[PDB]
Every structure is written in structure tokens, then in C-alpha cells.
């Protein structure tokens, strides 16, 4: 057939992206393998060099919707896939690539969990993403000899 198709998930007759390597060998080695007989490398049959056979790119697809009773807009997460090889708003997350949600700089309470600190909400019109809020912030008046005492109160159930 043709020559080396470096860096292309290709079906080879020596599938997988044909990335390269810089490993050595002992004068005879045919192909390449690792733990659980995984073809992770190969003594390239023709130019006798080492190429890493990384498995093809893959990942789950998750659909975030605010509910059909609120809107029919949708956001999509391609799980642990770099957001450049997916096929507006494209946003990269430690949990994959998010399309259909704009990234905001506020922090709210978590509503729809995406991951790696990131949640999503139907607030700001469209889906938005952010790093969730742990909570609000209370300061203290500690000195070395000062106490606070409650004067009124409340019964709660």
C-alpha cells in the first residue's frame, strides 16, 4: 500500500495513531508489547525504529439539560477528550470538553455537577459553567480575653 501515516488512527498491516518513539532494541525484535499483552510500541517492521501505538481517541458523551420543563437548550461534555479533536462556546475542563455553556467568573452553589470543581447552571438565557462556591465567608473578632454572648434566641424544627 502507501508509506508511514505518522500520527493518524489508521488500520495498519505491519488500529491506532502512529505516534513515534526513541526506544532501543536487541538485534531481532519483531513488534512491541507491554503489560497484559498491550501493543503500546512496535519495532517498526520497515525503518526499524520504535513507534508508540496509542489506542484511538475515545470517551463518553454526557448531556446536561436544565429540564424539558424549563428549556430545550442542551450542553455537551466529551469526557477526558482534548477539545481540539471533538468533531460558539468551547471550554476546556479537567473532565473533558464542554460545548454549549459559557464560562463565567462568578461562583455559585453547585447545581448540575460536571467535575473537577466545575458545575453548570441555567442562569445567565443559556447554560453557564463555573468553579462552585464552598460557601460564604464569616470573619472572627478573636483577641485574648474577649467573649460573645447571645441575648435573644429561636426555636427551630
Amino acid at each position: 500500500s502507501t508509506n508511514l501515516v505518522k500520527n493518524k488512527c489508521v488500520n495498519f498491516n505491519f488500529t491506532g495513531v502512529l505516534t513515534e518513539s526513541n526506544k532501543k532494541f536487541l538485534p531481532f525484535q519483531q513488534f512491541g508489547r507491554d503489560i497484559a499483552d498491550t501493543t503500546d510500541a512496535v519495532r517498526d517492521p520497515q525503518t526499524l525504529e520504535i513507534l508508540d501505538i496509542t489506542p484511538c481517541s475515545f470517551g463518553g458523551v454526557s448531556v446536561i439539560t436544565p429540564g424539558t420543563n424549563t428549556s430545550n437548550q442542551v450542553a455537551v461534555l466529551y469526557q477526558d477528550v482534548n477539545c481540539t479533536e471533538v468533531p460558539s462556546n468551547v471550554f476546556q475542563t479537567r473532565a473533558g470538553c464542554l460545548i454549549g455553556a459559557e464560562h463565567v467568573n462568578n461562583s455559585y452553589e453547585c447545581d448540575i455537577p460536571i467535575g473537577a470543581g466545575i458545575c453548570a447552571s441555567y442562569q445567565t438565557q443559556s447554560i453557564i459553567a463555573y468553579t462552585m462556591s464552598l460557601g460564604a465567608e464569616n470573619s472572627v473578632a478573636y483577641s485574648n480575653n474577649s467573649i460573645a454572648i447571645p441575648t435573644n434566641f429561636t426555636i427551630s424544627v
Binding site: 526506544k23 532501543k24 532494541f25 536487541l26 538485534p27 531481532f28 525484535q29 519483531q30 513488534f31 512491541g32 508489547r33 507491554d34 503489560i35 503500546d40 510500541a41 512496535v42 519495532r43 520504535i50
Partner: protein, 211 residues
């Protein structure tokens, strides 16, 4: 005399490249700590289940080995010869003598007298380990040329024999002998056994250690 190997004769079962893994295999491996028959420079030795051949010498005294069933005519015999030129492999019905050797002028070659029915014909200190094996008519030779600091003594250490020649002739090897250079102007024999070996490899694919 007899001697004790320590970790010797651990060849790569075969090819494919393997990075730093502990691939446990199960092939004809000389058992760790075996009893190698120390020879000195010889009688015909059986081939049985493969032959380990550590040769500790500087000057070329081991001048190849003869192999076969009756080691003569009527049945084919694989002769491996080594001269001042190169290696001559030949599977023919020969006429090996009671003492098949060569002299050293350089008048040599007494091994046989006949060479009929020639099927296969090929022509072209330092410890030299060799592993012979005829599985399914495939004479897989394995070799390890590791320079030593001794003279003719088996050293302590590890060596991964890299597969060398494979002869697809199909000859019954039940016995074998050693061709030696005589004077006109010490080796070791072991037998491989089915042994499970946890082969520890390197990122460069080398068997660095074994269990």
C-alpha cells in the same frame, strides 16, 4: 568434573519488544543453579531436550559442533564447522570419524570423509554461551559472546542469549559432539528443562533479571 551455574542460559523465548515488565514465560530454560559438566580440551554427548554450551577460551579451539541421530551416513547429520575463514553449515550424510577434529602449515579438516545427499549447505578472555534447540525441525541457535576476565572458568552473573540462526531443515538430533583444533605447530555442557521464568525486562527490551 562438575560445576554449578548460578544464573545462566536465560535466552529471550523470542522477539517482540517489551519495556520494563515482569513477563512470566515457560520455555526450555536451563534451571537456575544447575550442574554444568565441566569439559577440558571429546566423547559424543546426547542432545535430548536442547544443549547449553558455555565456552570459556581466547584462541579459537571450539571449531564448531557436529549434530544428528547416528552422526554418520544412512541418516542426515547437521555439521556446523568453523575455520580461519568463516562458518560452514551442512546437513548431509557424512562419514564422521571416531575422533572428528582438525589440525593446526594450517593442515586441517579430518571431521568426515563423505558428503552424500546434501540437503542444506551454507558458507560465508571471552565466554561464549550457546543454546541449541530443534523444536518442529527448527534448529534455533541462541548465542551470548560476553568477554570474561578469567581464562577457562564459569563466572558469576547474568546473560540474556540473543536468538541467532534458525535452520528449518528437519533433522533428528539425538546426539552431538564438539570439533576442536589440535596442535601441530575448556567448555561446559548443560541441558534445558521446561522452566517457568519471571522474565524482568528493561525499557530497552533487555532481560536484566529473572526468577
Amino acid at each position: 568434573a562438575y560445576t554449578n551455574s548460578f544464573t545462566r542460559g536465560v535466552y529471550y523465548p523470542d522477539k517482540v519488544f517489551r519495556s520494563s515488565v515482569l513477563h512470566s514465560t515457560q520455555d526450555l530454560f536451563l534451571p537456575f543453579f544447575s550442574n554444568v559438566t565441566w569439559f577440558h580440551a571429546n566423547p559424543v554427548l546426547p542432545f535430548n531436550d536442547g544443549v547449553y554450551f558455555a565456552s570459556t577460551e581466547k584462541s579459537n579451539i571450539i571449531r564448531g559442533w557436529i549434530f544428528g541421530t547416528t552422526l554418520d551416513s544412512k541418516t542426515q547429520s547437521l555439521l556446523i564447522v568453523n575455520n580461519a575463514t568463516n562458518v560452514v553449515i551442512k546437513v548431509c550424510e557424512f562419514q564422521f570419524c571416531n575422533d572428528p577434529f582438525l589440525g593446526v602449515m594450517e593442515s586441517e579438516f579430518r571431521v568426515y570423509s563423505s558428503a552424500n545427499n546434501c540437503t542444506f549447505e551454507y558458507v560465508s578472555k571471552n565466554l561464549r554461551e550457546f543454546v541449541f534447540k530443534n523444536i518442529d525441525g527448527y534448529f534455533k541457535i541462541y548465542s551470548k559472546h560476553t568477554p570474561i576476565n578469567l581464562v577457562r572458568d564459569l563466572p558469576q552473573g547474568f546473560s540474556a542469549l540473543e536468538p541467532l540462526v534458525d535452520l528449518p531443515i528437519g533433522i533428528n538430533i539425538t546426539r552431538f559432539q564438539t570439533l576442536l583444533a589440535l596442535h601441530r605447530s575448556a567448555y561446559y555442557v548443560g541441558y534445558l528443562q521446561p522452566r517457568t521464568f519471571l522474565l524482568k525486562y528493561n525499557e530497552n527490551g533487555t532481560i536484566t533479571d529473572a526468577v
